[PDB]
């Protein structure tokens, strides 16, 4: 139904020319009647635009080029506006006609055994191919297509990357006119070449003095299937080829206290990839004490006796407990000084001991709940963990009995040893064939080994190392917390059934002696008499049951600052891959706030949580911020990198928000004032442009411009309807004019706020506007370019140009005080911010944003935009551009579509020195001749230009004259009758039209 | 002679090792001071620093002075010992308070005795700057500043004048008492804020005799245990100095005159005569180092760089401790960069700090 769409667009066009017959003020002041039908009237010039809209689309002509008239020069603005509105209504109907056929038909990918081809089955009665990474749509630069839409990609794609393809169909020149197809089913590119992405270091830490753990995941662009990895470890070299699926390595046999540097790379079939680096220390070595200098103690546990041994060279010997039955498992505690006991049939007997003797006797503890078989002690959360026989199931109770909590699923094999790591939040146990893992709530179940019949194991909580004996093989062996690291160690040969470590020594029990070997002849030997069998040695050091972890540094410090207050938030030190979710996460914090100018600091210790507020700070002062973590025992951690943060200057700074529902609240620089205002706007409003203190203008998200009067809602708005297809709005305080980008008419409309008299101004394709009030330069930004419009045509200065595939201009702001001009470019996956002077282009930062949301913050000297989610606002200061403050949106207006820092001073009134005075009608006189009038001059001395209309007979002639004399030519004969109209103008306004009738 | 054999004799009669501490050397310097251990540290650091570029080490005779009424007889015994019992005698360094106390005996003996510069110049601006930045409130108070001698009162109101502070005694209930001495603030029965600045070393008797909630403004004594904690340069701490503490103001105030005198001795061995068997006529006219051609003012980082103690200046702090019954660390001013760290302890477990207006903003004149 083309001919119906064409005739309906032409009929709606001539109806819009009929109804707008007296709405727009003309630059010559025409004022035709409703039935004049002359050349100068609005109806004939607008109907000339509606008679040439389909001619311009067929012959690929612009609306300015189709509406060229010699009488109205250089821009016949009702003709151009009617042409652009008819073409925009036609392309809106042509996107509503083929909406379902574009959004239903999915293109298919085809490669033949040769570039990659799209096949789109599209039969229509500019286009863009867009690609997406499969882990934002980016346009394709190079393609070769035809009339059957068989489009071949000849651009170099990244290899071994999954891609989706879309067709963007721009129907009109408007950017809301695009139609997108459904995306293709995905295509992996074939592999070639070296890997081009480095691996990512997740954690790089030191386990003890001789081991060093690294964890990695692959990069984004592997350029092939991953076969292997290469690790090069160097001091401030060892090279190991780790296979494809593994994401951890622990480097053995290293020296202590040494800075190490590690390099990761990816090896496919073709070659090696790039190098990622990281710096790490091993640890400080423990001072290994000799055999004479041992003040520490052990506990030797047999089947029927528990015997305490001191490790002096003349060591004291004492029985703690002698049993009539056979003990199966026992517990120990360092800070409670409590020892638990268990038997063959289940009888829990707790016993407190101090310095190797009785303090409290053996009291029997019935378990309020399964017969108990093994036992371990949680020293942080103060629980007792029991592995019972009914199948076998690990539960946890309390020290008094009761509060039984079942941990994990049941299992078939018996538990021969149960050890609980409280500090890293783990439970370790062994079966007949295996060694395992759980956390304290039983979530992460992992099996560490599958070895035939292991022996005793000892778990080091700081060092993340499980030493394990295999007594039938005579083998002493070393396991990590995930089972990937199996280091065999040489055992001192005799079989031993138990062990302990004091540093790097080995405390092995025989039936006659305990020997401390760092052969069978030891460094030291302690005699045994009363214990024929010994299956356990428990060393009585607080490193066996620790409260505190090693290290701990906070990260991601950030701070939002006001004038006299701050809100500082950091995160908690991260958890190791050998640390579960049930680990020790109890830290205190210490925050050092350094005054830079005064060279003073104040440090707040015992900060319990990861957020701290500060208040009564000094305004406009630079502060440096670093934080560190303090653990339970109270030794400090490491400081962060210092964050330089500057407070706002002094003054009540109101920030005006607007919710997407339409509620306007006023906060302060942090978002803490929260004064809800009584006005309610429409859905998705933009920023408010005030004319006076009461009446303001705002643009909603669908393109409608609204006027609201805040104090009395009946009057104050000269327009009655909301006005369609408006992009931005600004105000001149000096001339008293409201400027908006008419997106349908492709123009800028200048309107008096008192009378509603609109004026079409020849600024074309503008999306956002600003006016410099000192001289009247109209700064505008297209999505492609950013320019300037002035009074003379020599003042047109273009500051930036975008190609279009790179992106578009998101907003701009004008800094008239320091002669600066900032803008935001929304791009392909990036948000860039720039700067240029008004009279050197400088990129400030590259980081998306709401359009027309970039506001200049003249107290802080910062720039503020609002993100597209509406829940976060970004501040970039000009003094420190690398630090971006993230201001949270308050919860009353929590999806936000507008943010505006309010002016503390009121708006200045209408300056009467930019109004042109009218020409007196008696002074317009006749001297090829000249026409002279009295020169119109404003209140302040400004350059007043004039515009001429020479309507003689039926022919008319228009002139744009800066001079008060009119060089008049081109009369056909003598005795003509001239109708002469003078309209004076400044750069801010226009004067009234003085119409005379003089005869020559 | 008898004075070379018996040594210095102090009246029972006391032996020489009770109050004289000696590092050996070819040239002998004499230090007569209350804190000899800082002097032994300064002569040890210029021995391992080798500013002289000579083979011979600098010797010290560090006389310990506990009462000031017996220093005249030991000055007579030291001018007899350093006239008779040595080969080369540079001079006798006396600290500034015993120089100003006993200037008639030094002028009457006419021997080469020079003052160590005073440590109160290194201490009293730190006192006025820790009092300048102190979190106080919005209350002005009545101050009463009690010193032992009037010279500490003149230099303390001078140091309060360069920190832009006025300290006036109004008639008001809020009282601030600053006591300058080791015996003035001993069980003070008056009520108010008590600041106590000790002059000498702080004993357990002084921390016992202070009231509760009383402020102790003192410097940190730095214990010497090993030689690797002083600098990255491998040196050797002498075996007498291990296990003993130095005061940093005595170290810097002696060490400026030691850097000036060994720079003069560089000029003297450059013009004269490095091996001391070949070298001759060390000391001919030695009073010219007090003249301004060889006397210079050095910054404290230059003193730690020249004498190889750059890792020591992190522990060179001036603290303010409150006695709560424990000495809680409240303030800390580093000597090498004058940065002032106050310590606040979130108690009551809050989540914000209302920042009090400081003591220099209240007392600003
Ligand atoms: C370890 O070395 C890195 C550079 O490799 C250095 O920046 C880091 O501070 C070093 N750790 C030390 C010695 O503090
Ligand atoms: C603002 O201007 C409008 C006309 O544009 C008028 O009705 C209104 O009264 C003015 N308000 C104030 C507070 O001046
Ligand atoms: C120091 O010397 C004086 C000399 O009169 C003597 O009375 C006094 O006991 C000595 N000791 C002290 C601690 O003042
Ligand atoms: C610290 O202060 C002293 C005077 O008390 C001065 O000589 C020195 O230069 C200052 N040091 C700095 C600013 O690093
Ligand atoms: C603050 O926390 C400490 C440590 O838990 C506690 O002793 C103290 O009572 C708490 N103070 C309160 C809640 O006022």
From Swiss-Prot, chain A:
Residue spans of the LDL-receptor class B repeats: 736-779
Q: What function is annotated for this protein?
A: Receptor for an extracellular signal required to instruct a cell to differentiate into an R7 photoreceptor. The ligand for sev is the boss (bride of sevenless) protein on the surface of the neighboring R8 cell.
Where in the cell is the protein located? Cell membrane
How the protein assembles, per its UniProt entry?
May form a complex with drk and Sos. Binds the phosphotyrosine interaction domain (PID) of Dab.
Which gene produces this protein? sev
The identity of this protein, by name, is Protein sevenless
Task: Indicate the family of this protein.
Answer: Belongs to the protein kinase superfamily. Tyr protein kinase family. Insulin receptor subfamily.
Location of this fragment in the whole protein: 208 to 1287 of 2554
Positions bearing carbohydrate: 259, 692, 941
**Entry domain remark:** It is unclear whether the potential membrane spanning region near the N-terminus is present as a transmembrane domain in the native protein or serves as a cleaved signal sequence.
Q: Where is the Fibronectin type-III domain?
A: 198-287, 550-650, 920-1000
UniProtKB/Swiss-Prot annotation, chain B:
Q: Superkingdom of the source?
A: Eukaryota
| Expressing tissues | Expressed exclusively by R8 photoreceptor cells and is internalized in a sev-dependent manner by R7 cells.
**What does the UniProt entry say about where the protein is found?**
Cell membrane
**Residue ranges, Extracellular side:** 1-365
**Residues bearing attached sugar chains per UniProt:** 67, 191, 338, 349
Give the family, as the similarity comment puts it: Belongs to the G-protein coupled receptor 3 family.
Known function: Acts as a ligand for sevenless tyrosine-kinase receptor during eye development.
What name has this protein been given in UniProt?
Answer: Protein bride of sevenless
What organism is recorded for this protein?
Drosophila melanogaster (Fruit fly)
Gene symbol here is boss
Q: Which residues of the full protein are shown?
A: 109 to 501 of 896
